[PDB]
Design a protein around this ligand. Structure first.
Ligand SMILES: C=C(C)[C@@H]1CCC(C)=C[C@H]1c1c(O)cc(CCCCC)cc1O
Ligand SMILES: C=C(C)[C@@H]1CCC(C)=C[C@H]1c1c(O)cc(CCCCC)cc1O
Ligand SMILES: C=C(C)[C@@H]1CCC(C)=C[C@H]1c1c(O)cc(CCCCC)cc1O
Ligand SMILES: C=C(C)[C@@H]1CCC(C)=C[C@H]1c1c(O)cc(CCCCC)cc1O
Ligand SMILES: C=C(C)[C@@H]1CCC(C)=C[C@H]1c1c(O)cc(CCCCC)cc1O
Ligand SMILES: C=C(C)[C@@H]1CCC(C)=C[C@H]1c1c(O)cc(CCCCC)cc1O
Ligand SMILES: C=C(C)[C@@H]1CCC(C)=C[C@H]1c1c(O)cc(CCCCC)cc1O
Lengths: 326, 143, 326, 326, 326, 143, 143, 143
């Protein structure tokens, strides 16, 4: 059953590691489980329901222990599919992966906690919550979209901060005496931040009509400047998704790769100028196909087609001229 | 070595038909046509761009020796080969099936003779499992 | 008058079922009607206006019964236009449609209620409000746009939740003692959720300056992370609408369909390899026209044009070479 | 000086009617003026500053009357530039324009008011504020963008309304007894609307922990559904602006127009089948240039180029075949 | 070491003036420094921490003095890289730059303040904060995006203002008597502005059920109209960034420039019709490459290719016709 | 009238060379070529699409009479020519300058002989102000 | 049956002119050209991929028998034909008017002879209402 | 001057082969082909619109003299050449390296003879630092 064993091992590795479809459902389950623990912790804080919260939390934590331990061991076993993790040394290197190290250490620390330990339990719960990512994908995506719009976010922050400072100062001037809310410029700054973000507690609000007019005038644009980052990032995310959907179809990374591997094999077997030159050529084509993944490839295709057709027309001209001479 | 430099000079003279030390694209095209197949203008211009280290359209003999000095391991071309094999690794398990491998070699990109793919299945398949690996394979090519 | 009868029946079916233009106006009317009922129910809750609210609601409910009954019977009668619903069995199957079943059962339940029944009346009113969709179109559209951006929404939720947890914890630490609002970490979590969403009741707000500084620092990014989903989904919706408008014009689904039907007829009449293979080919063209509906078709068109042109140029080269030899 | 007189008249008509550049500055001035009046009216309401507000408002109103009267008469005079408004009857028809009628009637009503008249003054001020549009451009733009996204706005409203109703009902159930805020389901509906819009007065908020948990769970998605329309419309507006900028350059409406005018003149002079057919053809080209104004024209251009090149290649094939036969 | 000296001078000029990569890190540092000073000023306002805040602020201000002075002198020295600023007169002109003047004058004013001077210190701190831009880049970007969408923002403002006025008036009518919040129409306007922006202090909110219904009806659309500008500007910013990313690759500004410089040199050396006309032609091509930077260039490329191919086909037709005659 | 129908029949017979009452595109192309200009395939396909009222590629004589019955006023073609003129009215004042008018007539779209544009300046310029109007001009063509 | 296999073998031998059991694209092109129509490279290659179940460019006799084994009902081709007819059902009522039907057959897609569309009107019009149905019709083709 | 006008008239007569004072595109094409380089229809048409100040496709002598009245300083072409040089100034320091300068002149845009680039290096190197400037240089060309 070695074939069936290998099939099962590959399926387990795929579901535990990067999944594609219904495999994600499993993760959801475990995620909910760990999420549940987190929620129960919060409930343990309320003294009204602390007893029942802790009673459920103990068994939920032990269940988390069992699930995470079995998942970790299954992941270690299923790491054999990839070549880089084979045998004692290979699987030891696999356990050397940062997230596998995090998983094993959190498992052991939680086990020890089972054997004021509550704070450690809460910290471990949040630690597993953050480890749920397992790849940094969310952070990578957010950082990419933010850095792409770094100039826009910076200008939004700069102008919004200037608006906040100026509006807070003017309202403070208009409300310094006739209102205890704006006793100090720090209070006015707190008010300005709370309003321009549109949180608006109501603990501080202008009461003098001059202050009200100034606050109206400034918030009317400050709220927009403060809401700008949300819109900028949302539009950036949507455009990134749309372009990913469009680029999902082209699949123009195939021929350069085959050429690259063939040329590398030929040059390796050579051991000459043509072989090495062609290897460099094929690597060049490989990476030049890697980069664009966009409409620049299409413009390159138009340029190639047009220049080729022009060359064929020049050949036509030569042929017709020579025929006329004949 | 002395014989190594002598054979490089012989190869350059066969290549640089002019003999002035300034190899041109047309000489590459002619000698390659002698080798059997036809190179394109864009192909040759990319070749000259890759080999040239001065920016005048011609390569001097010291530059030719320098580009010959780069070995497979020295060039550090590992990443490109691994990522290409992963691109072919439709399953991504670290191994590539023999059927798909042969189909790709003999039917995709630069059509490759059955002899070369036979040599691949021979040398690369140390374990003979059909699901031939490409990581250890590129390691031994590097070595 | 059978021709006029059939024309009227088709018009009724079109207006009752999927309409296009001014037919929608009728739906608006009925929608308003049912909506009005819902509103009156709410007004019946206010004890100040309960008497008049119920007095109007009785007649409005009877009117709703009349309208829905006549509409249901007219829909059943007009279902004859489509072939699938003809005769006793056909119309019985039409009534088997899930939304027709819902309509008939809600009608029957409401009439029975007419003959603490108020709660059943409210539930039936909301039931007809939800049934007003009649197709799931709104749910389908929302699900499509959400699933398209599933990664973006998930990263937004993950980072926003981490920001919520961290900000609530830090403000709780900075306000645990000197403020009764943040008595328990659950209270701090409630505060964090209310502010980061920018609802900001003001029932809980930081009062210690350390707490105020921490809340400012964290909300300044938390509000953006919490507003992200709205922007992401809005941009996704707008882009989907724009691409739908663009794709509305191409109309490149005609010739493949004609080829498919013709080849299917030919293969049916065959009862051979050529006809069956051409039927498969025409089906292939049909589906391959079905899929893209986007610029990928245009890139395919460029590829086809370029390859055909190259073939013609090769033919030209052969002709000119042979003429030179001639 | 009739030439200079006509130049000045055309300049006045352009600045008063649809302007392009710095002409708009003038409008801003007058707009500010009328806007100022509106503001003063509000200030007249505050009894603390009623006296000074009214004292300034009388002068500002007389100034508004002077400015609007002189502007109206200058507009009537400058209407002579267009052919449709020439002479007694032409200028009478020009005054028949709906906005000119509104302007003259508001001017007359205001002067009469000058000779509880305050309410009429406020209504006239808001009337001139709305008339400031003079074309319906803002309403036309908003309606266009809304109707383009009608499906998306409708689904957003439907799902957000369902979320509002359900969340309000559940919070009402969880807070009916232990909180006087949610005394009646109408109060819960008011709370739900105020929170899901993120206005969050704080007059009503959940206080029971079950109510708080339910409110958190529901608002977390309700706020997004309620903010959706803003994002959808913002993205639609931005995309419309971007496509307008792109389409501003093509200017492919020239040759069809020239052909249309030439063919119309030829057909008029004919008084034959060729002339009328060409007139219809040129009108067809005119409208077909009118419609696309988008990338569909570009795809049509690709199709035309490809089919023409195919025809030339077929001619090539015929020529080479005949030469071979020769 | 003059070569190394010049390399260091150019590196210093690049990092101080427009930087590209890690140079920005330095700016961040200095920015934080100045920002820190600003924050300390706010802390000096709180009487609870005034002493420590001032004690740290004096040191931080002296540190800012040192850093800005050394930076200014290094910038003046490194200005030698550019040709326009060489020698006494060149560097004097460089100091004539508006931001260099601002820097030197703020440095001197701060030095003097070191030797109620607190207000001057705060104003100087905000002055350096604003001078941190050093180029107007943020203002330029915001103005560009706003002016591009001027029509959209104006319609949003107009419709939102009408909604604000109408909703405030109706709620005032429905709440004038039974609520002291809406004592005067100015109070109702303040309420309407605070709610439609979704700030929602809660200091004023409708309490009569008629007022609550009217407020619900109007805010349901007013909040969207008020949030529109944020979404419009966010989408505009995202689209601008996307188009900048796309246009970053084409790099089609090279050949026209080389032609322009070559033709200018030829015309200068001429001292004739051909050279001057070619100089004008090359300038024309230069600016015509400058303008599009968009897809209009691509449509021009398609037009050029198609017309060229058509010309080649006409030559083909002439050749084949003459061969047939031959 | 009887003579009107007779001349329409003569025109159709000259057009419909086949004489079966089913006029084809090639006949129109040939007769127009006789008239002097060469019609294109797309031009003729749009022509047949516009004139045809049945959808079979040919027009019967009654259809030809029906399309001939449409006069300038009856066709209600006012909006199209007005909007075209506004498109040309670069100033938008309701009048078009003689220089630009002649330039467009003789250089844009279908280049038009100097005689036709001379006739335009002769007839349309009732006031002779150079800023020749187009609304009254199109109105008198409608009448 | 034995005769069924014999006739399939005769058809394959007519198709596979080589006789080695490896039918190629050129053989399909030549035989179809004999049948009357000229097939394109894209057409023939797509034919080959659709028929092929191995991935070598040739089809053996067992594969040919397997593809012949699929009948109209077995292929489950219903959805495609129903949706195509709906695409043609410009009214969407479930019936297609005779005029539009004949126009589409004789003027759209693959040009179909008047005989085939005559057979359609004959067989599909069980009720003879002119508004021929495409559901019972496809039901009877499936059966 | 009188001799200036005489030589300008001689140049115009050489250009305007017709001699009617209406220089056409074909005349420029032919005379400049005699000068050596092959024009394009777009090239010569752009030339004509750039030189034309009436809008009829032909240039009269007064227009030719007027366009020649624009000297290097008068044309105010400073900004264009400055921005072009900045476009080449990949470092942006205000000076362009000699190697890159020569490479661009002899390998980019219009292929410029080695003599012209030699003249550039000769005249522009007032300081002879290799990092030739393009501001003082363009300043003396302006002067
Ligand atoms: C620079 C921003 C953000 C724009 C443009 C400049 C001005 C005039 C307003 C901003 C703005 C609002 O801040 C709010 C609205 C909504 C209606 C406001 C009711 C008076 C529209 C509106 O354009
Ligand atoms: C670290 C973040 C995310 C932001 C952005 C970067 C900067 C330098 C500070 C944070 C920040 C505050 O932490 C506080 C304020 C205003 C003070 C509020 C009044 C008590 C502004 C302010 O941008
Ligand atoms: C990761 C997000 C969401 C961005 C980028 C990181 C930082 C510095 C801030 C966020 C942000 C705000 O959260 C708010 C504003 C508006 C002005 C704030 C006034 C200090 C701008 C602004 O870029
Ligand atoms: C089911 C929905 C829609 C959301 C998203 C998915 C998850 C797992 C829970 C919901 C949710 C809460 O229901 C509550 C909180 C915070 C607790 C609030 C403090 C009382 C976060 C939180 O994401
Ligand atoms: C259907 C909507 C609107 C999405 C998708 C479904 C779910 C899981 C949440 C919505 C949503 C939020 O409503 C709010 C956030 C911000 C962080 C929330 C903190 C727990 C993200 C976030 O995806
Ligand atoms: C006319 C507008 C703009 C909206 C949208 C269309 C519909 C039918 C009603 C309006 C509206 C309310 O006027 C009130 C509510 C909830 C009641 C609030 C609780 C007192 C929802 C609600 O959509
Ligand atoms: C002109 C705008 C802004 C649209 C379109 C007209 C109407 C019906 C509502 C607006 C709108 C909301 O203002 C709010 C929602 C969210 C749910 C509201 C709950 C009743 C949807 C929603 O389309």
């Amino acid at each position: 059953r070695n074939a069936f064993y290998r099939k099962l091992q590959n399926f387990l590795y795929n579901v535990l590691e990067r999944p594609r479809g219904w495999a994600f459902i499993y993760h959801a389950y475990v995620f909910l489980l760990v999420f549940s623990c987190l929620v129960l912790s919060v409930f343990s804080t309320i003294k009204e329901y602390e007893k029942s919260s802790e009673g459920a939390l103990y068994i939920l934590e032990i269940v988390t222990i069992v699930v995470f331990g079995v998942e970790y061991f299954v992941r270690i076993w299923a790491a054999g599919c990839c070549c880089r993790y084979r045998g004692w040394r290979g699987r030891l290197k696999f356990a050397r992966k940062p997230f596998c190290v995090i998983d094993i250490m959190v498992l052991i620390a939680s086990i020890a906690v089972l054997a004021s330990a509550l704070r450690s339990l809460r910290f471990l719960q949040i630690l597993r919550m953050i480890r749920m990512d397992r790849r940094g994908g969310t952070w990578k995506l957010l950082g990419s979209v933010v850095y792409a719009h770094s100039k826009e976010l910076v200008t939004a922050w700069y102008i919004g901060f200037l608006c906040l400072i100026l509006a807070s100062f003017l309202v403070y001037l208009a409300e310094k005496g006739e209102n205890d809310h704006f006793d100090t410029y720090a209070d006015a700054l707190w008010w300005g931040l709370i309003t321009l973000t549109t949180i608006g507690y109501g603990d501080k609000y202008p009461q003098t009509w001059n202050g009200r007019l100034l606050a109206a005038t400034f918030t009317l644009i400050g709220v927009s400047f403060f809401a700008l980052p949300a819109g900028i990032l949302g539009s950036g995310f949507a455009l990134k998704v749309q372009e990913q959907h469009r680029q999902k179809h082209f699949e123009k990374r195939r021929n350069p790769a085959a050429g690259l591997i063939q040329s590398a094999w030929r040059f390796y077997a050579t051991n000459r100028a043509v072989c090495v030159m062609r290897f460099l050529v094929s690597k060049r084509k490989f990476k030049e196909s890697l980069r664009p993944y966009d409409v620049m490839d299409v413009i390159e295709q138009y340029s190639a087609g047009h220049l080729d057709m022009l060359s064929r027309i020049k050949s036509l001209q030569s042929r017709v001229d020579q025929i006329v001479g004949r | 070595t002395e014989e190594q430099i002598a054979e490089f000079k012989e190869a350059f003279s066969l290549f640089d038909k002019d003999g002035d030390g300034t190899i041109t694209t047309k000489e590459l095209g002619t000698v390659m046509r002698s080798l059997g197949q036809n190179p394109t203008e864009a192909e040759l211009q990319d070749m000259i761009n890759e080999v040239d280290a001065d920016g005048n359209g011609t390569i001097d003999f010291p530059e030719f020796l320098t580009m010959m000095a780069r070995k497979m391991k020295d060039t550090d071309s590992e990443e490109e080969i691994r990522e290409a094999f992963r691109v072919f690794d439709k399953d991504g398990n670290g191994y590539i099936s023999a059927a798909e491998l042969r189909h790709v070699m003999t039917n995709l990109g630069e059509k490759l003779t059955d002899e070369e793919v036979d040599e691949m299945i021979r040398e690369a398949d140390i374990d003979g499992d059909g699901q031939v690996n490409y990581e250890e394979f590129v390691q031994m090519m590097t070595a």
